[PDB]
Amino acid sequence: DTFLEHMCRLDIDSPPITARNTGIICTIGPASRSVETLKEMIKSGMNVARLNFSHGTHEYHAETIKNVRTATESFASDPILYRPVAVALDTKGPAVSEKDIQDLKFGVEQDVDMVFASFIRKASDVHEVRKVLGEKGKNIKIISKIENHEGVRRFDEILEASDGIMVARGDLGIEIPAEKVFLAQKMMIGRCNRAGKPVICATQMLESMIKKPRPTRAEGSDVANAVLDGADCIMLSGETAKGDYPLEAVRMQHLIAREAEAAIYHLQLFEELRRLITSDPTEATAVGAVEASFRCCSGAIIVLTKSGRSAHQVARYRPRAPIIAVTRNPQTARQAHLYRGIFPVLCKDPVQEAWAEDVDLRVNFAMNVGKARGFFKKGDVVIVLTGNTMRVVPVP
Amino acid sequence: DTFLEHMCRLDIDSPPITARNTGIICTIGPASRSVETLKEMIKSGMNVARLNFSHGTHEYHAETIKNVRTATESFASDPILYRPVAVALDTKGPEINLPGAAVDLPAVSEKDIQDLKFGVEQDVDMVFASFIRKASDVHEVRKVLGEKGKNIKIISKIENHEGVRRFDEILEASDGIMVARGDLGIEIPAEKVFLAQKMMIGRCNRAGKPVICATQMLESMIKKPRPTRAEGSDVANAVLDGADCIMLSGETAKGDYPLEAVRMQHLIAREAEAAIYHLQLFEELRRLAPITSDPTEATAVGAVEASFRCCSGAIIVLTKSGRSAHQVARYRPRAPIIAVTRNPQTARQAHLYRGIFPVLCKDPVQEAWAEDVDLRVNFAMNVGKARGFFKKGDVVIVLTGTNTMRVVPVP
Amino acid sequence: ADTFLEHMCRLDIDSPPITARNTGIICTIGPASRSVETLKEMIKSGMNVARLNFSHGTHEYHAETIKNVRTATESFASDPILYRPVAVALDTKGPEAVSEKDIQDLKFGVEQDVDMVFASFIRKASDVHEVRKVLGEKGKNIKIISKIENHEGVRRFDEILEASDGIMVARGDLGIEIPAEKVFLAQKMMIGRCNRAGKPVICATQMLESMIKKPRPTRAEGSDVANAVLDGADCIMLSGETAKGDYPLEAVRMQHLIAREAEAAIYHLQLFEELRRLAPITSDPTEATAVGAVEASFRCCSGAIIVLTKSGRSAHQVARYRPRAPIIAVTRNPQTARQAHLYRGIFPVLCKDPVQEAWAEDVDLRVNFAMNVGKARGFFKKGDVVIVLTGWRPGSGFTNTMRVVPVP
Amino acid sequence: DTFLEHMCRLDIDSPPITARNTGIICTIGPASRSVETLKEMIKSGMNVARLNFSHGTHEYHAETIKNVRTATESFASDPILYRPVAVALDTKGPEIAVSEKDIQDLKFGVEQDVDMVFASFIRKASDVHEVRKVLGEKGKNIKIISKIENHEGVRRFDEILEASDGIMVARGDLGIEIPAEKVFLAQKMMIGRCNRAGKPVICATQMLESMIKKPRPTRAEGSDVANAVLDGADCIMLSGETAKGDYPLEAVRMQHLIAREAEAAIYHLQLFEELRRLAPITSDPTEATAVGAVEASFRCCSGAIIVLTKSGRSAHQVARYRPRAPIIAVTRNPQTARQAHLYRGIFPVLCKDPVQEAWAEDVDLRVNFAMNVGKARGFFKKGDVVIVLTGWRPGSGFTNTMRVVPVP
Ligand SMILES: O=P(O)(O)OC[C@H]1O[C@](O)(COP(=O)(O)O)[C@@H](O)[C@@H]1O
Ligand SMILES: O=P(O)(O)OC[C@H]1O[C@](O)(COP(=O)(O)O)[C@@H](O)[C@@H]1O
Ligand SMILES: O=P(O)(O)OC[C@H]1O[C@](O)(COP(=O)(O)O)[C@@H](O)[C@@H]1O
Ligand SMILES: O=P(O)(O)OC[C@H]1O[C@](O)(COP(=O)(O)O)[C@@H](O)[C@@H]1O
């Protein structure tokens, strides 16, 4: 009923009985480059494979991308259990260096799902990046890395221009005093949550685990707090790129994140967002869905989406219940990992000629997915969204 | 944002830009008995015709019922504009003077048993059961009506101390409550009466059951063409208290100005809608609402939430028994509820609930169910457009099954 | 009671009111209530303010009424512990800006030492200023209450309210000008704004009209009074009921019962909490002191908030935030003791004891006096916790001290 | 108005416009043992010197205590600027109720006149009682802080909390027993309950481990400290950082900076408002007085809440409700001045002036002393509004008076 009291009844004896809602982004390098390691990392919880173009050639990275996709499709046999895995391109940065311009285009042909643009100071910088990507890769999400003072002063215009934000504490603190950094992090996560755009907490997550099999406690709580701050994704850098224990870092990331979900006071964030008028049918539909979900404790909110946006709008209001976003578009299934609470699910079944049946096919597919992964059981109540349409149905 | 501010920013210069959500129940008698008067009263806003069986014969009342129905069906030509009109039977109840604070032991007077039986065959929509002291009394009334009238809504008149003390068990047993204020103050001190009224309206609102404010609404208008305002503000406060319906007695039954009383009732009620602080009541109910597990309930919740979220012109609900519309009205949306039904009784009974605008579809049942549903939806759409609830392009919420919510633009 | 709905739900007519009446009763005095012996009864029945309607009567007539009111009032002066202050109000005839007839009536009010003035047909701030100017330096400590009786008064209510010391909603004159469906809106609006601004508001005209000829009121009238109290009105007024009717005394006794009952239906938490949200933020020691006092009073369920005041103003500031606990305003100024009845919840108490040379002793004297007053009237008992407000200096405008003390 | 907005309006361009409210506890050892280093650490912000009795003899620690007090009293010349410094004794505890070794260390604590004791491996209330029993009537004024370091301690935290005067979350020992991912939950749980109960809680172990060998810390450590402050911790503790490391002085200066910054990110409205909702109705004058004071302080943005206290409890009760304004606790008891550092927001101030025979004057003396302290340290200036709390009678337990006064 109150935040204080919610903190008071936190029980370490009760295990987390929810899936992880925070996305895990892993930087891939020498340590994690191999197909067999990537397999295990996906099994460990990796959602997005980051490529750092500060070093390496196009040939090198292209082989990394090939391995990532090879490993990912090893599980394609079971579509029910198949885990979509996004591919992110992180630019070297300085407006837009001559070198970046080629990496972005390389990104386009390599069909990357998103782009981490470095050292963004203003909206015009994001536009230039948008321009460079052009019509060809306009469906590639642009995530603006804030790494300096001006970027902070002009965060609002940057956020609107971008599809998402990355808080790079490492680069931030070189520029700004270390004691000011955590303030910037909380500010940006807040505004991104307010604006309903994905935010990523990045750099120096579990630096200790480069040489060690377990992390410190200052790192363990920092990750958890980032999740509690409202971050959509958490990122591992050197931990998975070069370290001795890349696989342990992911498994630890998973454990901490899943635990941190319990400490989340869902009532507050949802209710505060409600406090802050539309005319968009889909939006009003998403609102009703999230409201209903709290009132009947739904196992999940099943959403049929093509571009991902309808699921994104549901995630905006931050339901407790997991969002099962059903899509046949493999890119949107991969991009969905940027948003907290969305569990993307790729339907490989053939398009049924009868549209009503084809919709029912994708719904029941999600239903099977939910039961298998332990989201709900037969008899549980779930909400299904289709198109402007909300539906409260029992699980078959 | 706060209740104080809402009252402060009330502007009498700005006219009410909403329809009346409170039901008007008119007692019918000598003054309003004629078909031509009833016609006018329906156009003036009468929703429910009450019959007082304290006086009159079965022959007399039967003639009243015939006139009411005759007048009502004069508008049946246009189903788009047709306004359902309920028929209520108010029983005489057990009599003796009155003994304050005592526990009495009649139940259902011999005279009532005959009136209720008359009600069933006359096909009355609801019954105002007099002098209810306990749940067992409501059960006897339910049993007396039997299988014959199981669909007749029973409204329990609280008129004494014991009834108040045992209100909770009475409310659960009943389909609705009538605060018969007139009889209350005879039993209980006049200064205690307003407390009882507010208590009972509160609990009925909490329980999602219709409550009626009754007796001496506008007594002055029996002889006068306008009422006092002490009566006018009393009506307004009853509306603000949360009453679903307001009732005229002698005002329309015997008085010189029965038609003026209804038009005045309409004006005051419609005005009082503006003074309603909708956010509070809606939010307090959200807060008091338990976790359900009922699909239909969860559907109604999302609908009301959404309606606030997009300022919907209306919440269109397809219903058979009225129940689905009732569940939506429970959470008290600002937007009017257009309850679409083919059951004419359900269309008439809907007037007991605040905010529900019942609408009777007379179109034939289409063999294709999807088409038949769309037919009733578009019917409501024409219904909304005609009465000025919304226009083409406006956003409205449509409920169907019952588990489905839909946010659609007006054709 | 976490919600307003539940508060209404938990209303019990079986449980009797265990609070004093906080709403003031203003009685119009005329032929029926003129006699000293009747006035006694009305004071014993609960009358707080005697209104004089200058629509009719001569100065000779009214002057004797004032003499009658004061004679009856001072009959109880023997016991200062139980003495009930009784205000004298002058209600002007008004234009049928300021009619010449009013100009002499106001001056007459000054000479007669009236506590307040009900100014009729106020349309704007300049009207209130004219009334203020007319009263002049002579009686500038007389509270001006602006009667809103028309549309323009309603449209320009805000400028009128600041200029005035209080507001009177005259539904009777209102309903003539404005439609029989719009006043209750006007009534609630004006009471709201007066509550927001911390200025006394009075509900007037057609309170219990039935009781002119009848020994009992109607059912519509009883709830109308109750709702006015629940709306937030500081005072309720009887007109013909007490002026000419057959049962002026029964009207007061009924007014008292209804008002006392309506106190139970008040959801104190809301109004107090809503004012906290809207309170600006100050730097006035006296204001901050009052806030803490009202807060403390809720947090420890105080029997009363005892306030030493000279002009009444400090007690007014406590009442602004609407505590549940009664405010015992201790004063030696007899005028302010009479004027205090304009404010809901303030129980004025007149100390007649001589001024002690030691100021600390004089303060303690007035405090213990209130303590005895509280015990006598059944506000609290020995051992109960009460809040006492005082200042650091023997002057007015310096109350900065809050004290949580047990009842001796 | 909302938590989201408050986070959104965080501005790194605006420097912190507050003093540090979180206490800094420094473990003292070889690196920080010298009088001249301790001097610097006090100037850097050290409030409490911890002694780890896992190693070392009574001889060793006794000299440490002597140096701590020597360094502390070097500033005693100016009482206005004098900074009280507490002395904490951290027991070794049972290894694999109260070990035979601890019993001697605790008695050693009594003779050395330690201000508080960190009791290790507390599993239950009986353990805290045993520690209290051992300390006996001798040291009954020594605060007992129960170190939670295992599964059972967590499970039975509530009974432990009531028995103790405070709690220490020893994360280091916690994660050995419980999974590292479960710990932050335990930390937040215990800090919450201590905040709820108004008892001091300490975040301990592995604050800035990196600063043992490095001149600056990592960011995972920097944000961990900040979050502990935001969680609601009253004190933060440095261990090896100041005990043995190469940069003990840099650790304190860094601790201070992070803590001061984290104060800005605190959403004071929420915690204060949530506590009043959960606050029970109390008949204690001192409690109601503290409530009114904190309310007033928010309502007038007070520079400080000045509290005259003897045993410390009255300042503790004000801090319970978590005001934004700093609490200046005035006392002549040097132990309570040292113990005050356990509570967030309390700035203890030791009056060395002689006791005036006139008590009213003696009270005024201590008040103006706090006023000078506040002006000097930049808490407020002449003219600012501050809240002053005092009592009606000398001795402990009688503070019932709140006063809103301007700064001379
Ligand atoms: O989230 P998006 O990209 O707006 O797409 C939502 C669409 O998906 C659907 O659920 C299914 O549409 P398709 O069968 O064409 O994929 C539609 O109801 C709706 O228009
Ligand atoms: O309101 P009720 O009595 O529960 O019935 C609601 C019914 O109305 C409908 O919307 C229409 O069904 P019908 O074709 O029988 O009229 C159904 O979806 C639902 O079963
Ligand atoms: O309500 P007012 O007009 O401010 O009067 C309050 C004043 O009364 C006092 O309590 C005492 O004043 P007096 O001794 O002159 O009556 C002061 O502390 C305070 O300034
Ligand atoms: O916090 P504590 O221990 O109750 O001390 C509060 C005491 O301090 C005082 O303000 C001053 O008393 P002393 O002269 O003994 O210091 C008393 O009024 C009050 O009883």
Query: Which CATH number is A29's domain given?
Result: 3.20.20.60
A301-307 own/partner pairs: CB under 8 Å, 24+ apart: A301/A382, A301/A383, A301/A385, A302/A326, A302/A363, A302/A366, A302/A367, A302/A370, A302/A382, A302/A383, A302/A384, A302/A385, A303/A384, A303/A385, A304/A359, A304/A362, A304/A363, A304/A384, A304/A385, A304/A386, A304/A387, A305/A332, A306/A332, A307/A332
Ligand 3 centroid to residue C337 C-alpha, Å? 13
Q: Is A118 helix (H, G, I), strand (E, B) or coil?
A: coil
Specify the number of domains making up chain B: 2
Residue A121 labelled as part of a binding site: no
Q: Which of residues 176-235 of D touch A (CB under 8 A)?
A: 178-189, 191-193, 195-196, 206-207, 209, 216-224, 226-227
Do C15 and C121 have their domain in common?
no
CB atoms under 10 Å from CB of B113, counted, come to 14
Residue A162 sits in the same domain as residue A203: yes
Please report residues of D whose CB lies closer than 8 A to that of A196: none
Domain boundary residue among C240, C262, C284? C262
Partner residue facing A390 (CB), from B293, B405, B408: B405
Q: Which of D213, D236, D262 is the last residue of a domain?
A: D262
Domain that holds residue B77: 20-93+107-272
* Pocket, ligand 2, Cβ cutoff 6 A: B 318-321, 323-324, 400-402
- B44 assigned to some structural domain: yes
- Do the chains contact at B292 and A295, CB–CB below 8 Å? yes
Same domain for C315 and C202? Answer: no
Same domain, C130 and C252: yes
Q: Are B229 and B296 in a shared domain?
A: no
Q: Which residue has the tokens 């309390």?
A: D346
With beta carbons under 8 A apart, name residues in chain A contacting B397. Answer: 284
Residue A282 CA: nearest ligand 1 atom is: 4
Give the residue, out of B324, B366, B367, B404, with the most ligand 2 atoms within 8 A of its beta carbon, to mutate for a pocket test: B324
CB atoms within 10 A of CB B362: 10
Q: From the alpha carbon of B346, which atom of ligand 2 is closest? A: 3
| Pick from C279, C289, C300: CB nearest D282 | C300
Whether B230 and B316 share a structural domain: no
Closest residue by CA, ligand 3 atom 8:
C309
Find residues 140-169 of chain C whose CB sits inside 8 Å of chain B: 154-155
Q: Backbone phi, then psi, for A92, in 5-degree steps?
A: -75, -40
The reply to whether A184 and A168 lie within a common domain is yes
Burial of residue A195 (number of CB atoms within 10 Å: 0-12, 13-18, 19+): middle
CB-based contact, C290 to chain D, within 8 Å: no
Helices then strands, counting H and E runs in chain C, come out as 17, 13
Chain A residues whose CB is inside 8 A of the B293 CB are 296, 381
In the DSSP assignment, the letter for residue D101 is H
Using CA coordinates, name the residue in chain A closest to D10: A187
CA of D217 relative to ligand 3 center, distance in Å: 59
Q: Kindly list the strands in the beta sheet with A389-394, ordered across the sheet, starting from the edge strand earlier in the chain.
A: A342-346, A323-327, A301-304, A381-386, A389-394, B404-409, B395-400, B315-318, B337-341, B356-360
Structural method: X-ray
Flag if B305 and A296 touch (Cβ within 8 Å).
no
What are residue D288's phi and psi, to 5 degrees? Answer: -60, -35
SS3 annotation, chain B: CCHHHHHHCCCCCCCCCCCCCCEEEEECCCCCCCHHHHHHHHHHCCCEEEEECCCCCHHHHHHHHHHHHHHHHHHCCCCCCCCCCEEEEECCCCCCCCCCCCCCCCCCCHHHHHHHHHHHHHCCCEEEECCCCCHHHHHHHHHHHCHHHCCCEEEEEECCHHHHHCHHHHHHHCCEEEEEHHHHHHHCCHHHHHHHHHHHHHHHHHHCCCEEEECCCCHHHHCCCCCCHHHHHHHHHHHHHCCCEEEECHHHHCCCCHHHHHHHHHHHHHHHHHCCCHHHHHHHHHHHCCCCCCHHHHHHHHHHHHHHHHCCCCEEEECCCCHHHHHHHHCCCCCCEEEEECCHHHHHHHHHCCCEEEEECCCCCCCCHHHHHHHHHHHHHHHHHHHCCCCCCCEEEEEECCCEEEEEECC
Query: Which CATH number belongs to the domain containing residue D282 in this structure?
Result: 3.40.1380.20
Instruction: Note the Cα C125 to chain centre separation in Å.
Output: 23
8 A C-beta contact, residue B175 and residue B209: yes
Domain boundary among the residues A260, A289, A318 is at A260
Tell me if A47 is assigned to a ligand binding site. yes
Contacts of D165 (CB under 8 A, 6+ apart): D116, D143, D144, D145, D199, D200
Q: Which two tokens stand for residue D216?
A: 């600056």
B161 is in an annotated binding site: no
**Which protein residues are within 6 Å of ligand 4, measured from CB?**
D 308-311, 313-314, 390-391, 394-399
Cα B405 versus chain centre, distance? 25
C182 closest CB neighbour out of B226, B228, B271 = B271
Write down the residue that tokens 């009686």 correspond to.
C139
* Tokens 């982004």 found at: A25
Consult the annotation and say whether D396 binds a ligand: yes
Strand partners, D167: D146, D201
Residue B394: closest C-alpha in chain A? A279
Is C72 found in the same domain as C218? yes
Closest CA to D308 of D276, D349, D252, D344: D349
Is residue B101 one of the residues assigned to a domain?
no
Does A12 reach chain D within 8 Å, measured CB to CB? yes
Q: Do C400 and C304 sit in the same domain of this protein?
A: yes
Say whether residue A297 is in contact with chain B using an 8 A CB cutoff.
Answer: yes
Residues D34 and D70 in one domain: yes
Any known ligand binding at D312?
yes
Instruction: State phi, psi for C331 to the nearest 5 degrees.
Output: -150, 155
> Coil, strand or helix: which one is D149?
coil
User: Which tokens go with D299?
Assistant: 């309502």
Is any Cβ of chain B less than 8 angstroms from the Cβ of A279? yes
- Quickly count helices (H) and strands (E) in chain D: 17, 13
Across-strand partners of D26?
A: D49, D238
Q: Yes or no: say if C235 and C202 are a contact pair by the CB < 8 Å rule.
A: yes
**Domain shared by A178 and A294, yes or no:** no
- Rounded distance, CA B243 to CA B177, Å? 10
Evaluate whether C380 touches C407 at the Cβ level (below 8 Å): yes
Q: Which residue of B has its CA nearest to A381?
A: B293
Say yes or no: B390 and B259 in one domain. Answer: no
Say if the Cβ atoms of C288 and D296 lie within 8 Å. Answer: yes
Answer whether residue B217 is part of any domain.
Answer: yes
